[PDB]
Design a protein around this ligand. Structure first.
Ligand SMILES: [Zn+2]
Ligand SMILES: [Zn+2]
Ligand SMILES: [Zn+2]
Lengths: 114, 65, 43, 188, 103, 85, 56
């Protein structure tokens, strides 16, 4: 009778920002990025890419509740390294890897007659 | 009533082969497993979706309306 | 405005009129679906 | 007739009862004069609840029946308005015993302390439920409540972004013809 | 170089391949987007004008919704919620008609 | 004098909702009025906690010949968290 | 202003005199100015204590 709006899971609500970045006082140079209308798909990949970087120290993604399509990513890097720059670099690396994988798959499919 | 359009577990379309399944069972007198394998159902989800279905639509159509 | 359960023939009877089918003695007298537009979704 | 009841003495005279008797009633008129009359002198009883009479106070704030007001001059009597006259207002106060606590004061000397959409099939235009048939139940003002045909839920959506259709099919019309043209469903 | 694909076998509607030099998280995210995030065209709204079958309007509408539809040019098509249209314009929706009766 | 919150617009001239009509809340399903001696409404409001599309309506005569009406309403219920299996 | 239909809202407003006015039935809800000493029947919000019990 009051089931959640299914489309609302992946659609931003009125007056809602896609990303909300706030500082974290638990540790120095730590930030919390709340992703709205997102699932484990992007959070896990972004966190895995972040952990692959030596400069990045801590990168953890948490889903508060399955009901709400939203998660929070805590990122802490070394001194003098802005976490937003690290996230941007991780996203760029993910895009490059995805493009390379797409090109390889297309080449393999073209090579195969079937 | 009618065979489900897609498998509940995976979502594979299984409604196309219900008539083929019945024809194989009757025309070729093949066993359930062999007919299902020939139709192209590997995962047991679709196997039980097709095998366990009951054609109540025909029984409902038996009535005049 | 109405149909017979067996004959399935339209009657279009009015008020202060018998509710029995004209073709047969059966008087179930089912009613046809509303003419108003109806929409449904697979969700 | 009971205490505090409003009595229409004549076509232009309205009084408030301060002592309800069997056949003799003591009533204060709009001029503040208290007089004793008989049951026959009362033409009819004015229903305060159904009386749509309003006045303007000194500060300009609208005052209706039952609102608490305080006189700006005099004894600053505080009380609830029972009825509003063309040039006077009757106010009953629980702190005054004289005249059963009912006094007549001038309004300037006191200070206060058809929906076309409803019942028509509609389709939403700009929302997550656009293109879905709905039936309008009620409107709360600037927003219309619609029950979806295919969903067992009622949703509130702005009426301006909904297109109205005829009882049976028909063409869709936005919320611009019904407001201008008199409510009439299109032709199927 | 990056990640490479080794297609062990391919078919009309089934392809088995191998991904190398790729993280587990990336593969899982790829699977998730492929199973959920790929746009597709399917019947969304069903309007009934004359139905008298033993089945129910909601039942048949649900069955129709699951019917696959061609979506090769889905990218060209635009979401209805995006384009400025009154309702199911040709630029954001596909309209089909179902007619039948017994004998 | 007795009028309830149920919307009577869904009712047709005959006073019975035809199949395919959306009804919810206290919407009247059967419109019946008992003369009083001018008349008082005696409609059968829909269940407050249940709603759906009216499936079928039939009108017949009882054993004594009095008009009798039976309206069947059909709803589609999908599994939810609170449902028991 | 949100109204009874919207969850973070209210359905009834209690004035000083004690009379209760409903919001859904009143089309001028947005024009009502709240005054000190009045009471509003607001929908239960987060961090609102409530007793949970089982019949046995
Ligand atoms: Zn399957
Ligand atoms: Zn007949
Ligand atoms: Zn469009």
């Amino acid at each position: 009778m009051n089931a959640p709006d299914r489309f609302e899971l992946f659609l931003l609500g009125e007056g809602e920002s896609k990303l909300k970045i706030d500082p974290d006082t638990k540790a120095p140079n730590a930030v919390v990025i709340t992703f709205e209308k997102e699932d484990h798909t992007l959070g896990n990949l972004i966190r895995a890419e972040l952990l692959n970087d030596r400069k990045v120290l801590f990168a953890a993604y948490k889903v508060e509740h399955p009901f709400f399509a939203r998660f929070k990513l805590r990122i802490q890097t070394t001194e003098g390294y802005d976490p937003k720059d690290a996230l941007k670099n991780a996203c760029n690396s993910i895009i490059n890897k995805l493009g390379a994988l797409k090109t390889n798959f297309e080449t393999e499919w073209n090579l195969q007659t079937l | 009533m009618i065979v489900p359009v897609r498998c509940f577990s995976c979502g594979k379309v299984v409604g196309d082969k219900w008539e083929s399944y019945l024809n194989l069972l009757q025309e070729d007198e093949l066993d359930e497993g062999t007919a299902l394998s020939r139709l192209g159902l590997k995962r047991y989800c679709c196997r039980r979706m097709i095998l366990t279905h009951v054609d109540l639509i025909e029984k409902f159509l038996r009535y005049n309306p | 405005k109405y149909i017979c359960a067996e004959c399935s023939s339209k009657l279009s009877l009015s008020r202060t009129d018998a509710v029995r089918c004209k073709d047969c003695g059966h008087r179930i007298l089912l009613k046809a679906r509303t003419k108003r537009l109806v929409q449904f979704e697979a969700r | 007739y009971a205490l505090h009841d409003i009595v229409e003495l004549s076509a232009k005279n309205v009084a408030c009862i301060i002592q309800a008797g069997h056949d003799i009633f003591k009533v204060i008129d709009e001029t503040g004069k208290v007089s004793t009359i008989t049951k026959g002198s009362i033409l009819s009883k004015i229903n305060t609840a159904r009386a749509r009479v309003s006045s303007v106070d000194a500060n300009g704030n609208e005052i209706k029946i039952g609102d608490t007001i305080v006189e700006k001059v005099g004894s600053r009597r505080e009380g609830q308005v029972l009825y509003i006259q063309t040039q006077q207002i009757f106010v009953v106060s629980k702190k005054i015993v004289e005249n059963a606590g009912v006094f007549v004061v001038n309004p300037s000397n006191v200070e206060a302390v058809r929906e076309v959409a409803l019942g028509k099939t509609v389709r939403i235009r700009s929302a997550g439920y656009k293109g879905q048939l709905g039936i309008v139940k009620d409107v709360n003002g600037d927003k219309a409540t619609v029950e979806l045909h295919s969903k067992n839920k009622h949703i509130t959506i702005d009426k301006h972004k909904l297109t109205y259709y005829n009882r049976e099919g028909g063409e869709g019309i936005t919320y611009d013809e019904l407001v201008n043209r008199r409510g009439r469903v299109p032709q199927a | 170089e990056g990640p490479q694909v080794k297609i062990r076998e391919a078919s009309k509607d089934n392809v088995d391949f191998i991904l190398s030099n790729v993280d587990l998280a990336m593969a899982n995210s790829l699977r998730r987007v492929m199973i959920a995030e790929i746009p597709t065209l399917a019947i969304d709204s069903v309007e009934v004008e004359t139905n008298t079958t033993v089945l129910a309007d909601e039942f048949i509408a649900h069955r129709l919704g699951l019917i696959p539809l061609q979506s090769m040019d889905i990218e060209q098509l635009e979401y209805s919620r995006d384009c400025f249209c009154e309702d199911h314009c040709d630029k954001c929706s596909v309209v089909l008609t179902l007619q039948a009766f017994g004998e | 004098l007795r009028m309830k919150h149920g919307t009577y617009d869904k009712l047709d001239d005959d006073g019975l909702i035809a199949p395919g009509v959306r009804v919810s809340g206290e919407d009247v399903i059967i419109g019946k009025t008992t003369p009083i001696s001018s008349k008082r409404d005696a409609s059968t409001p829909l269940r407050s906690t249940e709603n759906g599309i009216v499936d079928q309506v039939l009108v017949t005569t009882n054993q004594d010949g009095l008009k009798f009406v039976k309206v069947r309403v059909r709803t589609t219920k999908i599994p939810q968290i609170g449902d028991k299996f | 202003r949100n109204g009874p239909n919207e969850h973070p809202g209210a359905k009834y407003v209690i004035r000083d005199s004690g009379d209760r006015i409903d919001l859904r039935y009143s089309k001028r809800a947005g024009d009502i100015q709240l005054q000190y000493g009045w009471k509003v029947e607001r929908h239960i919000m987060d961090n609102d204590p409530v007793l949970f019990n089982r019949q046995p």
